[PDB]
Design a binder for these strands. Structure first.
Length: 191
DNA sequence: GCTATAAACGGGCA
DNA sequence: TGCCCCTTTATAGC
């Protein structure tokens, strides 16, 4: 609630919007059995090899594979992603699979924020051509590939920003603080 | 729906 | 190894 200015000298804190984590349930799973018995689980192996299962709290989607690997998507924080993963693991256990909870790992963190002024994207693409891809007839946002940390930002004329590719939220924050002074150089008036 | 980004998974191609 | 999918999420123009 007090913004730590040593991590956010802009004074702006990106909001986390999506976490991807993995965990190894460490046993073989009968996906047809799981899809039949579990209420909110779909399975079309012709299309995709996973059982797709969804829970309401934390609101998430798991991809559960016959190998015992699981991907958990959609949570708003690292803690919520781990808590959701444990709930999916318990669902599988309650069906009689002896599932464990091995090597849980946060794999991707997506954040977004709003610098609250419009941005002349053409100018940023021009001066940062090596890191920028801006093709407004293909997609209206500028794609910025930051090297340190290795992070991708989507930058929009509105001042909204998407920040993805982090394994640690401090990478999300560092990328935003690296880009904020650059964005400010291309601020334009809002009609 | 399409177009754009990252990551994991199993799985098609080379 | 790479390519192409696969779900999720913010963003936003056709």
């Amino acid at each position: 609630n007090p913004v730590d200015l040593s991590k956010h000298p802009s004074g702006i804190v990106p909001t986390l919007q999506n976490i991807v984590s993995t965990v190894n349930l460490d046993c073989k799973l009968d996906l047809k059995a799981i899809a039949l018995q579990a209420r909110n689980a779909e399975y079309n192996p012709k299309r995709f090899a996973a059982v797709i299962m969804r829970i309401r709290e934390p609101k998430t989607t798991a991809l559960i594979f016959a190998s015992g690997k699981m991907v958990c998507t959609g949570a708003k924080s690292e803690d919520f992603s781990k808590m959701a993963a444990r709930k999916y693991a318990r669902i599988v256990q309650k069906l009689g699979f002896p599932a464990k909870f091995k090597d849980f790992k946060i794999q991707n963190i997506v954040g977004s924020c709003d610098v609250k002024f419009p941005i002349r994207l053409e100018g940023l693409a021009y001066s940062h051509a090596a890191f920028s891809s801006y093709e407004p007839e293909l997609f209206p946002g500028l794609i910025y590939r930051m090297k340190v940390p290795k992070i991708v930002l989507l930058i929009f004329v509105s001042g909204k920003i998407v920040i993805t590719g982090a394994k640690m939220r401090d990478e999300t924050y560092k990328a935003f603080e690296n880009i904020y002074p650059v964005l400010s150089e291309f601020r334009k008036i809002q009609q």
